[PDB]
Amino acid sequence: NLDYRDHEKDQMTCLDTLAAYYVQQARKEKNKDNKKDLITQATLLYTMADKIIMYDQNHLLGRACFCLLEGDKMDQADAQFHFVLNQSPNNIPALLGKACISFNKKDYRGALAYYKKALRTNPGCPAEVRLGMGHCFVKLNKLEKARLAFSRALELNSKCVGALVGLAVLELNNKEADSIKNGVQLLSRAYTIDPSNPMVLNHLANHFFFKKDYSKVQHLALHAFHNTEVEAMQAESCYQLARSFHVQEDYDQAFQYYYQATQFASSSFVLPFFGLGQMYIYRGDKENASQCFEKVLKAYPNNYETMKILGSLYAASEDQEKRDIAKGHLKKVTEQYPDDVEAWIELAQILEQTD
Amino acid sequence: VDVTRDIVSRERVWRTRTTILQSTGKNFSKNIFAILQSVKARE
């Protein structure tokens, strides 16, 4: 306000952009700046924005979104997002903030009811607000709903890869049917339009792994690893590298990748625990392969995991801590017939002390 | 010679002397030392 005759309102509207686009730009960081470099500028000017007008339609958005960037205080962010309904909720993303916090607490029922209001009004957003709804239609067995969400997102704008790689992930389960669409239309198209994505790089790597082309899996998994920040993608990017190294009789480099796959993200999937189980067999340190294979049964048993601890069975005699698991594993290979050849040997190798 | 470690490393001894002493079942001494101690107090 130099000579504008009481124009403080537009000044606060100006500083609101400097208190919201900083948090919006902190997520898509480049290679010369860090996260705190855009967080510290988002924390200073927000206090100066609240000197004129406090607690407005967007000022609570900053207090709520400050917690998503550090990964803590979820109840604080949900209680700050609810206030925009009680002050003046004149937009849809004024309410969409609660569903992202409901998603972080593993609440898809509370998130799906909030993502419905995003399509009725359908306000303006280049990010295809229908994409987060198609992302929650992934769970609770709504495959008829998530494709119908990704198709509209692909018809409004094909620039978005977030509506295309989902259909690739919706189609990765069919390995005998629809392979060309899954390696070309869902993997070669998402790659040429956006090569800096570690998801499509991981999926092109795991697709090339079955075709016995290991020259590109290790090349793409290095680029699928350095640009990601959250622990969900990096454990899998290290897991592809250690899987490509195990089949080459290269367990030295693959052991550290198998350790990083479990040290980064342990409750993600059963694959890193099984990889460390088959890896600890090396160098005669098969003691820890049992500890790492114990967590494989905790999710679900497998006909392939039963022979792992049976082969690496340290039970010898008068040792019921370890023979019960070999017996219970052998009871799994006894019914099924996956070309059993040595399965009956390990059966009788325990029953010599017993009947 | 190596014929010793060639055989003592692959064979299996399921039964030996001390095996013979314990029952194959589960007969602890809670039901044994009880009467064993009751006999000493009456004397």
Curated annotation (Swiss-Prot), chain A:
Keywords: Nucleus, Phosphoprotein, Repeat, TPR repeat, Transcription, Transcription regulation, Wnt signaling pathway. One of its GO terms (cellular component) is euchromatin. This is RNA polymerase-associated protein CTR9 homolog. The chain holds residues 72 to 426 of 1173 of the full protein. The keyword Nucleus applies. TPR repeats lie at residues 58-91, 92-125, 127-160, 164-197, 235-268, 270-303. It is found in: Nucleus speckle. Widely expressed. Its main location: nucleus. The keyword Phosphoprotein applies. One of its GO terms (biological process) is Wnt signaling pathway. Component of the PAF1 complex (PAF1C) which has multiple functions during transcription by RNA polymerase II and is implicated in regulation of development and maintenance of embryonic stem cell pluripotency. PAF1C associates with RNA polymerase II through interaction with POLR2A CTD non-phosphorylated and 'Ser-2'- and 'Ser-5'-phosphorylated forms and is involved in transcriptional elongation, acting both independently and synergistically with TCEA1 and in cooperation with the DSIF complex and HTATSF1. PAF1C is required for transcription of Hox and Wnt target genes. Component of the PAF1 complex, which consists of CDC73, PAF1, LEO1, CTR9, RTF1 and SKIC8. The PAF1 complex interacts with PHF5A. Interacts with KMT2A/MLL1. Interacts with STAT3. Interacts with SETD5. Interacts with ERCC6. GO terms for molecular function: RNA polymerase II complex binding; SH2 domain binding.
From Swiss-Prot, chain B:
Residues 1-33 are annotated as: Interaction with CTNNB1. It comes from the Eukaryota. This is Parafibromin. Component of the PAF1 complex, which consists of CDC73, PAF1, LEO1, CTR9, RTF1 and SKIC8. The PAF1 complex interacts with PHF5A. Within the PAF1 complex interacts directly with PHF5A. Interacts with POLR2A, CPSF1, CPSF4, CSTF2, KMT2A/MLL1 and CTNNB1. Interacts with a Set1-like complex that has histone methyltransferase activity and methylates histone H3. Found in a complex with BCL9L or BCL9, CDC73, CTNNB1 and PYGO1 indicative for the participation in a nuclear Wnt signaling complex. Interacts with PTPN11. Interacts with SETD5. Belongs to the CDC73 family. The chain holds residues 218 to 260 of 531 of the full protein. It is linked to Hyperparathyroidism 1: An autosomal dominant disorder characterized by hypercalcemia, elevated parathyroid hormone (PTH) levels, and uniglandular or multiglandular parathyroid hyperplasia, adenomas, and carcinomas. Hyperparathyroidism 2 with jaw tumors: An autosomal dominant neoplasia syndrome characterized by primary hyperparathyroidism, ossifying fibroma of the maxilla and/or mandible, renal tumor, and uterine tumors. It is associated with increased risk of parathyroid cancer. Phosphorylated. Dephosphorylated by PTPN11. It is found in: Nucleus. Tumor suppressor probably involved in transcriptional and post-transcriptional control pathways. May be involved in cell cycle progression through the regulation of cyclin D1/PRAD1 expression. Component of the PAF1 complex (PAF1C) which has multiple functions during transcription by RNA polymerase II and is implicated in regulation of development and maintenance of embryonic stem cell pluripotency. Found in adrenal and parathyroid glands, kidney and heart.
